[PDB]
């Protein structure tokens, strides 16, 4: 009841730009269920636009635990990597998705960014 | 029908490979960050280290609005391949009215 | 010399295909539309239809001034092949006095 | 982070020969007349003589600053090929600080 | 303690347009202590406020629970029925709130326009 | 004393009936949304479906400032029985100084 | 959602009589000269002749755009009752999308 | 024809009672306060020691100019029947050159 | 894990002037973990620049509970006893101050204002 | 070398007592609310309750941006001595890059 | 809360000596040319007869109203020690609300 | 009489000795650099290294004007004492006639 | 009757800073009745307000002949014959204003200003 309201509010926050407050509203919900895929998800979401990669990243997992069919997890997860410098991590998450979502091009693209950077 | 506006931004930015160029397209465009990406190659002459160099990179162009200008700025130094890059923004004075509101509601 | 202008309108847009590009700039050309046209292959990545596409377009430049511009735009909407085209329009500060009277002159 | 700036320019010109682009691209970045150039191979239709010319030509792109762009663009018509040289100048509104700065550092 | 440092963080976000963030900070307060009913009150203001007519509705109908001699929370119980479309809910709402006030124009104003729609 | 003002706005709009022209005057003021409201049965002459129509209508005038126009508007848009409602903002150029006082403390 | 106008007018003149106040509102709604008329029954005192009167007149709104209210202003001055007739132009700073649309689509 | 004016004022207000409201229109008339004024049974609802109030009152306009607003007001405050009178002013930002006239000629 | 994650946020939204949706954030992480010290005094910290300075000294006295070895909030408390005209308090927590931080001239002149302000 | 600035602030107000003076300059600096603060002793005369007082009180100058002025000017009100203290802002036209650099840097 | 103001002025003016610059501080207050005046002891170094002078003199400082400035500047002429002396206008561009209220009431 | 002037300004800097504040008052007037200065002993405090510290500092005011602002600018960084010196630029905006012709020759 | 109107006629005036106006006023007051020693005072503040010392100084005397315990107008008295450079009847005119009113600062000040000024 009280966590679907909290997790409408951070998703509202979300779209305003406000990430901070959307950060605090997906904390929030996530006291109540800690088990909600989407509330994990959506929380990595917030954190990798705001820049913070490493809780981007801790968020995303926690997502694919409770969820490992989410191909925009996924690929989400390997762009926080390819943010970090950590191309092994980027390409076997990137892999990941492109098995969920094959014609995904943005995971596709990805992958042939990070193949190409550790190959350098 | 041309119609004056001021909220609508092109940021223009040079990365050195074609794959980075494309991946930062797609990327800045699925995440509503740019509503559209144009990749040019081009040859860039500059002084890096006090030397000239002349190199095949390949210009970005993100259209945007005034609004998710800074939030597009923001994300692409996060992510670009160079320690100091090219961050220029120019401000289309018209356009027309239908692709105006196309480009606002694709942010 | 540099002499500030305001008189003096850069038409931007995006055709799918060369044939069409030279056209289109042909066109414009011979009736006094615009002075110059530059025809420049980029990629484009845009959302179609809530998909992602990358493809291979031609971008038109077209030379003109703030008198001939709504001319030039009408006739272009009227012809272009896209059912919502690109229309930008930038604005240069400042041009030679040769080139703008040139610029004038071939309208 | 992005900054309001008037004291950048952007001169837009065209050369017929690549080698000539080099060159010129090469010689102004040299003396400190621009920053940075960047050359790209575009197709160019006008009226010369009164008869349609469809040609390709190369373009040029010089960053500078206004304090710096008379003087560069004084060396250019010296040395153009063409007797009547393209001279646009467009004004970015905006840069990144670092940008800017290493922008001026280098004229 | 904590609980009413958050409800009044709520009503000084209420007051200065941030309804959202008041959502966040009267939800807070509400694990705190479920049984508060200024705070169930005040977040279905917030919600009505904001627009959301159905978790304003909720809000109003558990404050009601823990105190149904609230006259403003009949009436504004009624004004989300009526925004709804809802005019049976909102002539019922509408006649306890004046139950409880008589000399309530706005209620009573309401009242005649809730029973006017009704009858088209 | 007269003083200049630009924080005071007049929203004028109209609704069919006085039971709902009351209705929203109580309750916009009652929760600070306009400091008063005047009610005027008009007779409103416009184009309903291509047909002329004539009809008894009631005038409503919220007297709010610039920071509470807005929230007015929100509320009223998602309140008013009519499909598309008039929204006409009017702004006095000067008032009394108790008489702005007044209605800033009121909202 | 309120957007700030300049290109709407609202023409405030007042007739002797009810039948002519019906008149000129539907002549001027049907002929696309005013998008909306309202008529108010006021009392008005102004000195005729030298000599106070106090008469019973209705006031009449038409809301036109910028662009519509010369040719309005002209129909009502060949046609107002009055020799000498009342002509008062205000201007909304602000109006809703869909009103505004509404508003300039109908004349 | 009309012609942009800023000299011409509407002052608005409100008295509880008609035999007030014709008094206070005749009396600033008689004297060169008021060119006109206009008298509108309205329905105003505020807030009066913190309870809503819903009364009939009776809404005047004045039509003055610039230079003798100053001269009006003061009077009307000394006499109006409320102690915190409304006072608003509108400006037209055109009108009739007769009107005008007219109007300036009867202060 | 997430008591952090709100500590941290509060943190970024105190450094930007969001004292209210600092004092939500800092409220959030004494939920999971109420023995958090610095918790406690950044609470106060963002109470206190608010200007409530009653719910300012029940954080600090919370926070010196836990960590009596603070300095800082020794010499806030007695910034917000100060506020209050509670010259008596002022002056003990000023000179709790200055004895873990004897080279603190603000806690000094603190001292001295509240002396002088007591013999008035 | 000098640039000219709008973002630099000079608030300037007057404690009764020195003790008072130190301890508001030193907590307004520690806590970012202020850069720099200059205490200055001066004679004061003004008209406290209908008669004239001469007193020895310290004038104090806070340096400050204007995003940080607000939250000074609360800060010191809530905690100036005087129940109505002097509050004036003067803003510097120009200063050198490195001092405003460490102002800003310093809040 | 502070407002930006523009009707308050500093005028700052030096003299010889504490006994003058006590007697200019109580006069200019008692008689409404001035709200408050501040005398600090300072310094001056300037050219007297064409050879440099280090002096010790006292600095006025008058916080007035952009009304009342004229007439304090003409009365301090007529009464300044002096032959030439120094008259410097200052504008304070906001102040609290409650400070600006005592400043303006005091003259 | 008060004449609007933009041509004078007041440079503030702050100096740790009373030795170097008038020796720094006494070259710069000498050469025209200003026309008078003078020198008050304030407390400062600010952070530096990272604490606090309270000092006995001189305040220094240059009155000069905006042509020879510049001059005495570059000197002043080129002498004073301090690594980083504070330069905060004033502008009068009025002076009387004789005192700003006195100052205007004396540099 | 028609003297107390143009007395307070002037003193309008002169309120507004119309100090020609006002003594125009005053002046046609004193025909009406020459013994009024507040419209003697009154114009000679007029006129000192003006800058005309020597009409000022003659109004003042006349004031002081009517009411010569007028603490005021033996103040402003040595205040015009100070803006004249004469000291030795600032100093008798200040000290007359100090006997009437000894708690007078301005008078005070000026006491010691025409005495030192004298001395120089």
Known sequence: NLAEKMYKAGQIEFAKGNYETAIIAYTLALLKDPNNAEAWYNLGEAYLALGNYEEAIEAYQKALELDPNNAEAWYNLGEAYLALGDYDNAIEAFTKALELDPNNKTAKAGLKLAKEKKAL | ?107
Do not use: M
């Open chain 2, 1 to 107: 029908s041309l119609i004056e506006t001021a909220d609508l931004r092109l940021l223009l930015t040079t990365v050195p490979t074609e794959t980075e160029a494309l991946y930062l397209a797609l990327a800045a465009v699925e995440k509503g960050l740019a509503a559209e990406v144009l990749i040019t190659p081009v040859t860039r002459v500059r002084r890096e280290n006090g030397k000239l160099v002349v190199e095949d990179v390949y210009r970005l162009s993100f259209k945007t609005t005034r609004e998710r200008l800074d939030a597009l700025v923001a994300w692409l130094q996060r992510r670009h391949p160079l320690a100091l890059p090219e961050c220029l923004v120019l401000t289309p004075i018209a356009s027309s009215v239908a692709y105006r509101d196309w480009l606002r509601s694709s942010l």
